[PDB]
Structures are given as C-alpha cells and as structure tokens.
Design a protein around this ligand. Sequence first.
Ligand SMILES: OC[C@@H](O)[C@H](O)[C@@H](O)CO
Ligand SMILES: [Cl-]
Ligand SMILES: [Cl-]
Length: 251
Amino acid sequence: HHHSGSHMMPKRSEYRQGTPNWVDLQTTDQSAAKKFYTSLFGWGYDDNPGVYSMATLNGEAVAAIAPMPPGAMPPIWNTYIAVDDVDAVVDKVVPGGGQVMMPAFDIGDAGRMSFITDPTGAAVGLWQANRHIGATLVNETGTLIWNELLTDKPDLALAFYEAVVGLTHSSMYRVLKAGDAEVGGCMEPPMPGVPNHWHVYFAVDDADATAAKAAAAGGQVIAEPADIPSVGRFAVLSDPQGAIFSVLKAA
Ligand SMILES: OC[C@@H](O)[C@H](O)[C@@H](O)CO
Ligand SMILES: [Cl-]
Ligand SMILES: [Cl-]
C-alpha cells in the first residue's frame, strides 16, 4: 500500500462507520493517470505534499491519485471504510481471521488509517477521519458510485466485516448495510484468476461512450459494456498504466 430534502445533491460531510468513504489510486505515472481520469470524468486536481493529488469535480473531493512507494508493481485502486476508532477496530482483525498489513498510523492531520485484509485476502483501508473525511461528493456522474467486494467466500468475508466494523447485509447478490443505509455490495468474482478484492465503480452517463473513450485515451476495455438487469449498464476498464476499475450507468 502506498501509505507504507430527498432530492438534494449527494454531498457528504460525514461517514457512518462501515461506509466506504474514499478511493485512491496508487500508480506508476501520476501525471499520465491525471490526464486519463480527466478524459473520462472531468476531474481537476489539488496537489498536496511525494505529492498526493486530490481529484476534484465541481469544487468537491471525489478521489485521489498517489505515487507508488519503493518496491518493483501493478497500479491499483484502493478502497477505504470509515471507522470511529481505528485502533479499536484493528484489535478485532486478527481474532476475526484477517491480517493487519499496515499497522495503524497518522497521515499528517488528514486522519489515521490501517490497511487490512479480510479472511479471504481482500485488502481494504480503515479510515478514522481528522481533517479529511473522504469524498465530499458521491453517486453523481464522474464520482464514486459503488464499492463491491468480489470474493470467492462471501459469507466468510462478510462475517468478518460484521465482527470488525459492524456491517450487516441482506441477499437479493449481497447488499451491505451500515445501520439502515445500503453502502455497497458483495458477490463472487466473474472469472478464475481474479483475486479477492474491493472493486471500484465510478458513475457515468453512458458506459459505452466511456469505454470507447478509455480505449482512445490509451487504456483498455477489460469487459465490454453490458447490462446488469434492473441496475443499469457497466464496463470494466483499465487505465493506461494497468489499474482496473468499472464504470456504471444506473437506471
Ligand atoms: O450511505 C452513504 C453512501 O455514501 C451511499 O449514499 C452511497 O450510495 C454508497 O455507494
Ligand atoms: Cl502524461
Ligand atoms: Cl480495449
């Protein structure tokens, strides 16, 4: 890991524990990644001292792009889940059958985080906010719309998130809940050779158009645009550096 009123706009100023709160990209070429994600999503950036490049859209923080640490590596989109007391949560990880990959530490005055794996090996950050809460805009076009745990052992994984952050779920595909709020999903991965991981979806107006634009911008279409019944339409894409993520047009 690199750190080593119902109709209102979906602004966020707070995250309940268990809610995915943030995604960031660690990459081999920050400059190039910036241009690519601008091409797809229209992001601007605020560089903060390497440099952590905060992606912005309509005056709101939506994600970030970070440089790699030493060692080697394929670029990756990281997911973070909000927690009230990261130290307390971390204390439950090993008893719950997971691993603490990166022990808890303070990131400037942004917050405090740990990087863990669940018992199925899917990695996720635990984020205790100080100055930085996470995304201040979600769901809208160009922003984070869904976080999905792709794992070959959903119930085992989800028992762990219940024990450690209090996430519950219901089946319909598993929809994850932090209290009464739906905050993400979980299912078995699409193909052999896909590691268990937290998958990142950004909202788009037209999955097909975005997929075409991705290829034209030097990325790759990993899974061509396809419909998910009653949900909408998605494509799985790679940026030109190799980082995989999906785009979703919701119906
Ligand atoms: O519960 C708060 C979350 O931000 C939800 O509004 C998003 O839809 C999760 O994807
Ligand atoms: Cl470039
Ligand atoms: Cl392609």
